[PDB]
Amino acid sequence: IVQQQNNLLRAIEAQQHLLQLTVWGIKQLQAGGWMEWDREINNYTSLIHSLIEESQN
Amino acid sequence: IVQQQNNLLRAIEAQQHLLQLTVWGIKQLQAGGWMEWDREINNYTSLIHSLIEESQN
Amino acid sequence: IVQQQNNLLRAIEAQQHLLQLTVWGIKQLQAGGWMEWDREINNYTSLIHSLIEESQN
């Protein structure tokens, strides 16, 4: 079960990289009315980083 | 292992919020040929909500 | 705990489908300077597929 929990964390980490690439792609396409979307992307990005670092530890 | 499973669920929840923000961003940029993409986004969004609520319970 | 690990894997699988739909949506909007973004999307997509198949097994 330990090995499976490590697998799932590595999957979540790799999905977060993919998510960050899609956020970056959307910002390149939008580049102004997006301030609240940027606030929420930033807050949830920081939130997920904290949870991943907690899980890694 | 219980604490780790809670960590991973909170990470998946925070990633789902980020995913929903990226879907919303893409819909704002597209705003017509997207009907099947919308069907699939809706079905998988409902699917993930059901799995998160199951996991929370 | 086994049932919970299966729940979380199914959630990660459903999120990967959603992620792939958002990548596809972004590529339709961009359709040229995106070569490195495509390389990284491909590498992380392959990485996550390997981790999901490992977890399923």
Swiss-Prot record, chains A, B, C:
Glycans are attached at residue 43. It is found in: Virion membrane; Host cell membrane; Host endosome membrane. It is a single-pass type I membrane protein. Acts as a class I viral fusion protein. Under the current model, the protein has at least 3 conformational states: pre-fusion native state, pre-hairpin intermediate state, and post-fusion hairpin state. During fusion of viral and target intracellular membranes, the coiled coil regions (heptad repeats) assume a trimer-of-hairpins structure, positioning the fusion peptide in close proximity to the C-terminal region of the ectodomain. The formation of this structure appears to drive apposition and subsequent fusion of viral and target cell membranes. The mature envelope protein (Env) consists of a homotrimer of non-covalently associated gp120-gp41 heterodimers. The resulting complex protrudes from the virus surface as a spike. There seems to be as few as 10 spikes on the average virion. This is Transmembrane protein gp41.
